[PDB]
Design a binder for this molecule. Sequence first.
Ligand SMILES: *[C@@H]1O[C@H](CO)[C@@H](O)[C@H](O)[C@H]1NC(C)=O
Lengths: 48, 48
Amino acid sequence: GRLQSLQTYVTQQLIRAAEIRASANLAATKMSECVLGQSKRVDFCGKG
Amino acid sequence: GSFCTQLNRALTGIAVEQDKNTQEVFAQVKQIYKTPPIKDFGGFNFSQ
Ligand SMILES: *[C@@H]1O[C@H](CO)[C@@H](O)[C@H](O)[C@H]1NC(C)=O
């Protein structure tokens, strides 16, 4: 029972880590395109 | 114990995420724009 609980927690943490990894990749891309430069793709760096 | 309340929470998160996904994809307009009554588009046909 305890190992099944730990494995479920580890798997859920891995899925959440994948979601955070995608969010961090988006944040790095936003830092490179919007902060490090000027972005001509609309709505990538806010409305307008 | 809490194994399946955890499972119910996970399913609830999936459903909420699906609603958010649809809203993010389609609700990109603050106002509902309405097509003009006359289709005078310079010869471009949008009836389809
Ligand atoms: C567009 O095509 C449809 C069917 O081919 C036709 O009924 C319609 O009149 C066309 N649009 C215009 C503005 O003529």
